[PDB]
């Protein structure tokens, strides 16, 4: 599925290439989408489960 963030924005989970949890938020980078790579962040509260599953143990 997709990740909603920020100017709302949706990026498909397969495009997330890097992600960590810090300071109550989840921080991620993603591949070319609409022809441009980029970053985002979502509060740990509103984070999709398959996003959170990409995090390191534990």
């Amino acid at each position: 599925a997709t990740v909603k963030f920020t100017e709302e924005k949706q990026v498909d989970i397969s495009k997330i290439k890097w992600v960590i949890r810090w300071g109550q938020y989840i921080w991620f980078k993603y591949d070319e989408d609409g022809g441009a790579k980029g970053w985002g962040y979502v509060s740990e509260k509103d984070a999709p489960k398959e996003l959170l599953q990409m995090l390191k143990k534990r």
């Binding site: 290439k17 890097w18 591949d31």
Partner: protein
């Protein structure tokens, strides 16, 4: 099932990680992204046989030479990568090869020569030089671009085909 123990080697910055991450995750490793040494598994179908790729993405500068040798001892086949705009990395190729043969103690080690960054306009290692080198080793040569994903599947699969030929 049958697992293939693949080892990606080559000079620093030739695109070992970019090739491996494209194959495994369909992302492009740019200059800001992790390129650190790690292993990756992927199940694939090659010529109608399902198999598992167990891929070691090695460091350009390996910390322990005896560790690197033990990597090569375990490895069943090797992607020797250079960048087509880096003559040193190309000259570094024979180096990796001899190291692999000496450690393996064998003449028929499965091996594919990979010329990466073929998307770039400024080439300094033409196809003929690589094909010639590859010819003298008796191994295939594959041109890749981890950026555009050109030849990524080809490089690794051709390496598997090489192992299937002993």
């Amino acid at each position: 099932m049958t697992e293939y123990k693949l080892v990606v080697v080559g000079a620093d910055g030739v695109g070992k990680s970019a090739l491996t991450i494209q194959l495994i995750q369909n992302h492009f490793v740019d200059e800001y992204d992790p390129t650190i040494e790690d292993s990756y598994r992927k199940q694939v179908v090659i010529d109608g046989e399902t198999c598992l790729l167990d891929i070691l993405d090695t460091a350009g500068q390996e910390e322990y030479s005896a560790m690197r040798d033990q990597y090569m001892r375990t490895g069943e086949g090797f992607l020797c990568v250079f960048a087509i705009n880096n003559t040193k990395s190309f000259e570094d190729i024979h180096h990796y090869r001899e190291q692999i043969k000496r450690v393996k103690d064998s003449e028929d080690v499965p091996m594919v020569l990979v010329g990466n960054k073929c998307d770039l306009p400024s080439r300094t290692v033409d196809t003929k030089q690589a094909q010639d080198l590859a010819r003298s080793y008796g191994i295939p040569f594959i041109e890749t671009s981890a950026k555009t994903r050109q030849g990524v599947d080809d490089a690794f699969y051709t390496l598997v085909r090489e192992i299937r030929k002993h």
